[PDB]
From a paper:
Class C Acinetobacter-derived cephalosporinases (ADCs) represent an important target for inhibition in the multidrug-resistant pathogen Acinetobacter baumannii. The class C Acinetobacter-derived cephalosporinases (ADCs) play a significant role in antibiotic resistance in A. baumannii. β-Lactamase-mediated resistance to β-lactams can be overcome using combination therapy involving a β-lactamase inhibitor coupled with a partner β-lactam antibiotic. Many ADC variants have emerged, and characterization of their structural and functional differences is essential. X-ray crystal structures of ADC variants in this study provide a structural context for substrate profile differences and show that the inhibitor adopts a similar conformation in all ADC variants, despite small changes near their active sites.
For example, ADC-30 and ADC-162 differ only at position 220 (Ala220 in ADC-30; Glu220 in ADC-162), and ADC-33 and -219 differ only at position 222 (Gly222 in ADC-33; Asp222 in ADC-219). ADC-162 does not contain an alanine duplication, but ADC-162 and -219 both contain amino acids with carboxylate side chains adjacent to Tyr221 (ADC-162 Ala220Glu, ADC-219 Gly222Asp). These two variants show an increase in catalytic efficiency with cefotaxime, but lower kcat/KM values for cephalothin. In the apo X-ray crystal structures of the variants (resolutions ranging from 1.24–1.89 Å), the Ω-loop conformations show more variation than in the complexes. The two variants lacking an Ala duplication in this region (ADC-30 and ADC-162) have Ω-loops with nearly identical conformations. In contrast, ADC-30 and -162 form a tight turn that restricts the active site with the Leu216 side chain oriented toward the interior of the enzyme, and the side chain of Asp217 forming hydrogen bonds with the main chain amide nitrogen of Gly214, both presumably stabilizing this turn. Overall, the B-factors of atoms in the Ω-loops are elevated more in the Adup variants, suggesting that the Ω-loop is more flexible in this region of the Adup variants: ADC-30 (loop 20.4 Å2; B monomer 21.0 Å2) and ADC-162 (loop 23.0 Å2; B monomer 22.3 Å2) vs ADC-33 (loop 20.8 Å2; B monomer 18.8 Å2) ADC-212 (loop 21.8 Å2, B monomer 19.7 Å2) ADC-219 (loop 41.4 Å2, B monomer 35.7 Å2). Overall, the variants that do not contain an Ala insertion showed little to no change in their Ω-loop conformations upon binding of the inhibitor MB076.
Author numbering: 1 to 359
The structure:
């Protein structure tokens, strides 16, 4: 006798709402999409000092979830014939021709297997020439293609190459091509002055207000800011690629194609992929120190799972994000917070909610 919207709201209250007090989080948005129906749940404040409530207009930083848009842009360029994933970056960034990095192909950059790229660029790498110099001064370590080391500069370089192949800056690739194609109208790389009233403050571990600062290749690495409705629309696109033109549909499918495995995790383009149903510990393993912070041998796909799911965590200094979707259940979930909470808690709460929602 309890409507579905209330049943979903109860589950989110039971599993996500307690994190607000536990981690002193000022604001949170949680969205679920099931069978094309959308459910939006907002908690707390987008700005504590302004007493401004989180709502459908609130803009949050997506952190590494931004890489999903980078991956989509790459799949688009690839299916338009502008790039091949077997190309090397010096084909597009001419100053990298005949450098060591020009031995690494685009898929290997996008999926973190160059063998010598760390989590972040060096702190001192700021300007555009310093980014080029960094890649000019790059030398291999581990054999190329053998080891996955999660890396922002790696997929950042992929994004820069994608932009070069489309003859537009990367921010324009998203704002002029990819976001319009996905029907996202409240998503930005650069939030305009006329929308700053909707840009949440982020909050650091001392609950002090902050927002993301500029950095090298920030746009393809962590540059996107979006709202909960827009993120539900992005999940909807991933659940129903067949509702988009050939180019964007094929781009989305590109991002869903598993490329290799590390144990139970399939590395797709941007997305991490798993056999469904996935155990909680499979999903937690994807965010372990061993997988996130250390290099791991990759293995070829053995089981190509017919029934699968996908997820991605992302953070900035002041924000947390988690997105997950299960195609054959026609369901997905987005969590946005304006303070970081542990990845494990995001994964656990979403697992509890999605598994309890009535089919």
């Amino acid at each position: 006798n309890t409507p579905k919207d209330q049943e979903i709201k109860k589950l989110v209250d039971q599993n996500f709402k307690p994190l607000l007090e536990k981690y002193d989080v000022p604001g949170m948005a949680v969205g679920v999409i099931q069978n094309n129906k959308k459910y939006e749940m907002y908690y707390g404040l987008q700005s504590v000092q302004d007493k401004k409530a989180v709502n459908s207009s609130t803009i949050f930083e997506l952190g590494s979830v931004s890489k999903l848009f980078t991956a989509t842009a790459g799949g688009y360029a690839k299916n338009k014939g502008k790039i091949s994933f077997d190309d090397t970056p010096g084909k597009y960034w001419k100053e990298l021709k005949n450098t060591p990095i020009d031995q690494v192909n685009l898929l290997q950059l996008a999926t973190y297997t160059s063998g010598n790229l760390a989590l972040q660029f060096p702190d001192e790498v700021k300007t555009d020439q310093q980014v080029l110099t960094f890649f000019k001064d790059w030398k291999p370590k581990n054999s190329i293609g053998e080891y996955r080391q999660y890396s922002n500069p790696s997929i950042g370089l992929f994004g820069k190459v994608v932009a070069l192949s489309m003859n537009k800056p990367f921010d324009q690739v998203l704002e002029k091509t990819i976001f319009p194609a996905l029907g996202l109208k409240h998503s930005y790389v650069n939030v305009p002055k006329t929308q700053m009233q909707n840009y949440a403050f982020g909050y650091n571990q001392e609950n002090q207000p902050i927002r993301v600062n500029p950095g090298p290749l920030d746009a393809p690495e962590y540059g996107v800011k979006s709202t909960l409705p827009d993120m539900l629309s992005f999940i909807h696109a991933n659940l129903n690629p067949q509702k988009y033109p050939a180019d964007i549909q094929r781009a989305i499918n590109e991002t869903h194609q598993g490329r290799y495995q590390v144990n139970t995790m399939y590395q797709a383009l941007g997305w991490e992929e798993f056999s469904y149903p996935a155990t909680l510990q499979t999903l937690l393993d994807s965010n372990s120190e061993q997988i996130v912070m250390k290099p791991n041998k990759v293995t070829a796909i053995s089981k190509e799972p017919s029934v699968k799911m996908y997820h991605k965590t992302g953070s900035t200094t002041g924000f947390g994000t988690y997105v997950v979707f299960i195609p054959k259940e026609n369901i997905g979930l987005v969590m946005l917070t304006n303070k970081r909470i542990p990845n494990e808690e995001r994964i656990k709460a979403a697992y509890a909610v999605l598994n309890a929602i009535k089919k």
